[PDB]
């Protein structure tokens, strides 16, 4: 069962090994859950093999046979992922109605940034937790100054990006006055 | 409105033409050359 890391021995020394197109999302929306579950392993074994061949190509200072496969396979797996995820995220929207699979809150940290804080699983409730209790979600008053600076800095950047674009238009209009 | 001197080249030549036949660095370097030319006049 160790040979699934290698292509059929009929392929070994050959430059071009041809191959099919990667799976579209659409073709995958048609398959059941079980068949996706299987296809995931068929794709896994092949991705493994391909990576093996990759490294072994680097080792021998030789170009890899038909490198493109590795791309295709990845997309397929990736695509497959996107599908299964859909069917969960649709589903939970039905059952619970939360758009996010992980519990989380909008918080304001020490630095005054407005952060999305993901939650974490603990065996004990939050007020009994030493480590969590010593985080601070809130800002002190001094921070307010820095916040302002942030805004202003941001504003500047946007401000002179805008002015740049404007300028680029004028230049072109006198270079290409086809109007 | 920034204004820089564009023609500085010629400004220098009007000194340096009188200095051509001097010996040493006086015949090249504007600083030395200027003083030498004035002394010559």
């Amino acid at each position: 069962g160790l040979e699934e890391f290698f292509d059929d021995p009929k392929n070994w020394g050959e430059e071009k090994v041809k191959s099919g197109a990667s799976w579209t999302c659409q073709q995958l929306r048609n398959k059941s859950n079980e068949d996706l579950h299987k296809l995931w392993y068929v794709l896994l074994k092949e991705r493994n093999m391909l990576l093996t061949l990759e490294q072994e190509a680097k080792r021998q200072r030789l170009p890899m046979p038909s490198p493109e496969r590795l791309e295709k396979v990845v997309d397929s797996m990736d695509a497959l992922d996107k599908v299964v995820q859909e069917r969960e995220d649709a589903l939970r929207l039905l059952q619970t109605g939360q758009e996010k699979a992980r519990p989380g809150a909008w918080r304001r940290d020490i630095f005054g940034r407005i952060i999305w804080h993901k939650f974490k699983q603990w065996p004990i409730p939050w007020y009994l937790n030493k480590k969590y209790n010593r985080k601070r979600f809130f800002a002190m008053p001094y921070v307010e100054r820095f916040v302002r600076m942030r805004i202003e800095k941001q504003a500047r950047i946007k401000a002179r990006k805008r002015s740049l674009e404007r300028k680029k238009e004028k230049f072109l209009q006198e270079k290409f006055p086809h109007l | 409105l920034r204004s820089r001197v564009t023609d500085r080249y010629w400004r220098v030549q009007e000194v340096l033409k009188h200095a051509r036949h001097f010996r040493g660095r006086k015949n090249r370097c504007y600083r030395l050359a200027v003083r030498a030319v004035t002394r010559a006049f």
Partner: protein, 206 residues
Amino acid sequence: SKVTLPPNYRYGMSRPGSLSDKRKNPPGTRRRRVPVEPISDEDWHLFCGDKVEILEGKDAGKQGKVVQVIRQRNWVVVEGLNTHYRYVGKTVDYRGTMIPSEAPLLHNQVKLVDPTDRKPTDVEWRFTEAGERVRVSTRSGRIIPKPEFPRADGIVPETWIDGPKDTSVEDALEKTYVPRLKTLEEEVMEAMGIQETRRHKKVYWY
């Protein structure tokens, strides 16, 4: 693979991720920006494969097929028309194979030719009654087709043979889906007959 180009970059007809390119413009090159007439992607009337007439250069009044477009610099390539000669094979004792090569053209020097009378024309995008978007000639008042062209893979779908690891059209288009409310985990675990009793104790989230 996506190679990220530096903000200021020149386009030399060489594929941006290639040795010709890395050799032409190494890691730290920033050259003078070449002013490019901005064209929305919806105003762009030139594709690859269509017969076009050249309005400029030493070869003018001629017609040719467009091989490749470079959109970033607004360029077309008419194979074996706009031309300058270059040696390819080289070693110390041997200069081999002088090859005619193509210099790209701006889109101002090339006009699209309508099939019927083989004249150059001014193409304008029009919407017809079928919900279709086609190029219509200003001078001749006809619609011009679009140049169906081969693809980068050199693989034509009509002539094809399935290898070992290829899935057949039949099994790929087959719909196995029964859109029911269980997840992948519940589905699979039920199908493999894996039986689980215990449930998770309460977890606190924060």
